[PDB]
Amino acid sequence: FLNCYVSGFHPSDIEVDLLKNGERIEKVEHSDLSFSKDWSFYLLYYTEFTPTEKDEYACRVNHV
Amino acid sequence: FLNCYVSGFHPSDIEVDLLKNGERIEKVEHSDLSFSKDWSFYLLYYTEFTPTEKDEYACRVNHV
Amino acid sequence: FLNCYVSGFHPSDIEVDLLKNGERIEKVEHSDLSFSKDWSFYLLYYTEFTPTEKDEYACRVNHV
Amino acid sequence: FLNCYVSGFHPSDIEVDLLKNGERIEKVEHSDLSFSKDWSFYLLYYTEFTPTEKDEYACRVNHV
Amino acid sequence: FLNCYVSGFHPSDIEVDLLKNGERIEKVEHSDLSFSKDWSFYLLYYTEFTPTEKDEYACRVNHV
Amino acid sequence: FLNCYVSGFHPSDIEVDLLKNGERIEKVEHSDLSFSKDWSFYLLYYTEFTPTEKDEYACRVNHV
Amino acid sequence: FLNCYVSGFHPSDIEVDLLKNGERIEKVEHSDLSFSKDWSFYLLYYTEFTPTEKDEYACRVNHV
Amino acid sequence: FLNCYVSGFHPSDIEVDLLKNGERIEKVEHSDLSFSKDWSFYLLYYTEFTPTEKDEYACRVNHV
């Protein structure tokens, strides 16, 4: 068995995922492929954060 | 068995997912493919956050 | 068994993922491929953070 | 068994991941591939941080 | 006389006027006067301008 | 007389005026006066300008 | 007389005026006056300018 | 007379004026006056300028 188990929990996060699984090119001829001519990425532009308040875990296990 | 199990819970998050599973090109001839001519991405533009309030977990397991 | 287990939990983070799984090129002829003509990345531009408040874990295991 | 186990938890971090798994080129002829014509990366531009508040762990194990 | 006279014309401006003519206190006893307990002033908060287009004057005077 | 006269014209400006004419205190007893307990002034907070386009004057005077 | 006269014109400026005419205190007893308990002044906070475009004057006077 | 006269014109400036005309204290008893308990001044905080474009004057006077 197993008691008081956590698998990874995100409080208060922001996650960004992009081309996660690994792009593959095979057997192409006389081609130009580009992923981007113009790409823009901006995660925080002129920004203020304000706090993320307290994130708590309490476990008790007795007498197993 | 298993008692007081968590699998990963997100409080107060924002998740962004883009091209997660891994794009594949096979057997192309005399082509231009582009993912983007003009792409714009902006996650937070001129922004203020205000707090995310407390996110709590309480478990008790007794006598298993 | 196993008691009071944590697998890695992120409080208060931001995660950025890009081309995670390892792009592969095989068997191409007479091609120009580029990942980027113009790429822009900016994680924090002109930004202020404000705190992330306390992130707590309390476990007790007795009498196993 | 195992008691009061942690696997690595990130409080208050930012993680950036880019080309993690190791790109591979095999069997190409008469090609120019470039990863970047113009790439921009900027992690913190003109920025102020404000603190990350206290991140605590308390475990007690008795009588196993 | 006078020909082709201008007195000062504002194109495209914003003017702010506050306590212009000079406040005066005379003959007071046992008083607290304050102009402000809490005052807020913010001229441009998180703002973008866009241009003010061309502002032209043409005068001709002949044979006076 | 006078020909093709300008008195000072502001294009594209912002003017701020505050306590212009010179405040005067006379004959006070047993007083606290303050102009400000808390004052806030912010002229441009987190701001972008965009251009002010061309501001032209053309005068011609002939044969006076 | 006088021809093609300018008195000072501001293009593209910002002017700030504060306590211009010279404050005067006369004949006070047993007083605390302060101009400021807390004063805040910030002219440009985290700001970008963009150009002010060309500001032109052309005069011609002939045969006076 | 006088021809093609300029009095001083400011293009593209910012002017700041503070206590210009010369403050005067006369005949006070048993007083604390302060101009500032806390004063803040910040002219440019974390700022980028971008150019001010060309500012031109052309005069011609003939045959006076």
Author numbering:
A (entry chain G), B (entry chain H), C (entry chain F), D (entry chain E), E (entry chain D), F (entry chain C), ...: 22 to 85
The paper states:
In its native, functional state, β2m forms a canonical, seven β-stranded immunoglobulin fold that chaperones the folding and assembly of class 1 major histocompatibility complex (MHC-1). Following dissociation from MHC-1, β2m is normally cleared by the kidneys, but in patients with impaired kidney function who are undergoing long-term haemodialysis, serum levels of β2m rise as much as 40-fold. This leads to aggregation of β2m and its deposition as amyloid fibrils in the joints. Here, we created fibrils from β2m at low pH in vitro and, by combining assignment and distance constraints obtained using MAS-NMR with cryo-EM analysis, we solved their structure to near-atomic resolution.
The cryo-EM density revealed that the β2m fibril is comprised of two protofilaments arranged in parallel and is built from discrete layers of density. Each layer is related by a twist of −0.608° and rise of 4.83 Å, giving the fibril a left-handed twist, which was verified using scanning electron microscopy (SEM). The subunits in each protofilament have an identical conformation that is related by a 180° rotation along the fibril long axis (C2 symmetry). The β2m subunits have an ordered, L-shaped core formed by residues 22–85. By contrast, each β2m molecule in the fibril has six β-strands (strands 1–6) which are stacked parallel and in-register in the fibril core, consistent with previous MAS-NMR31 and EPR35 data. Remarkably, these β-strands correspond extremely well in position to β-strands B–F in the native protein, although the length of the fibrillar β-strands 1 and 2 are shorter than the corresponding β-strands B and C in the native β2m fold. The N-terminal 22 residues and C-terminal 14 residues are disordered in the cryo-EM structure, and β-strands A and G in the native structure which lie in these regions are not seen at high resolution in the cryo-EM structure. Residue Pro32, which is in a cis conformation in the native β2m fold, is in a trans conformation in the fibril, in accordance with the MAS-NMR data. Finally, each subunit is stabilised by an unusual face-to-face, three-ring π-stack (Tyr63, Tyr66, and Tyr67) perpendicular to the fibril axis which kinks the polypeptide backbone in the region where the protofilaments meet. The average centroid–centroid distance between rings of Tyr63/Tyr66 and Tyr66/Tyr67 is ~4.8 Å. This perpendicular π-stacking not only stabilises each subunit, but provides additional stabilising interactions between protofilaments, which associate via the heels of two subunits, forming an interface that is unlike that seen for any other amyloid fibril to date.
